[PDB]
Amino acid sequence: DSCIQFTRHASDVLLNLNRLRSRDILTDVVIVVSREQFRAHKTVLMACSGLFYSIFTDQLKCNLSVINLDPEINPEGFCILLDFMYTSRLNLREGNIMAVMATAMYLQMEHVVDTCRKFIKASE
Amino acid sequence: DSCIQFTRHASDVLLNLNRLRSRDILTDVVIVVSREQFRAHKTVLMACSGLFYSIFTDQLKCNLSVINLDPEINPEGFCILLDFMYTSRLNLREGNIMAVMATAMYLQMEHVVDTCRKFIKASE
């Protein structure tokens, strides 16, 4: 086509989606990770995770307001990944890399799994 | 912080949100523009438009499944802007620039209004 493109549009959209998350506006699901609860937008979760994409395209699960994750999932790893989904920034540290990679594999977040594997290979 | 960032994350999220729109997945509102209907995600509309942000943060309007736009709004101008919201690409042409600018002013999409004003100033 003969379209023009606004370079910062996608980044500005995600920034606004994160502002809605911070003010708890139009969040439509709670993700339960052991004793912790995380409110989010189903669409953003689906856009970032192969697992949430499969869950919310299921004719029964699409209507659930609460999703319980596997008990092996670490709440801090999930929190770090939820922040990444809404900001593109990953808080990857020596102390959390194993939990983050395990959570990203479960959530099916291929690019996160890739950088975790590379950061681990560098430290061996 | 000491975060790393995935450059393409925001673009990939928006691409996935557009795929959900194309398959009509988790769309939660219909925007009526005269005889035409456009299905969309309330969160994406709010993230792109000052008008939709104000509408869906209203305690009564946040719960509406149908929003009727002013009858002066052109359905083609709206369609072009809805595509822009979900893709960052604006199909701006000599034949549609006036309708697109009028619609962007109504929707409160400042960057679109700015490029329309510049393209119009160049042709005078």
Binding site: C3, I4, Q5, F6, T7 | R89, L90, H111, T115
Partner: peptide, 4 residues
């Protein structure tokens, strides 16, 4: 704005 750019030509994509």
């Amino acid at each position: 704005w750019v030509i994509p």
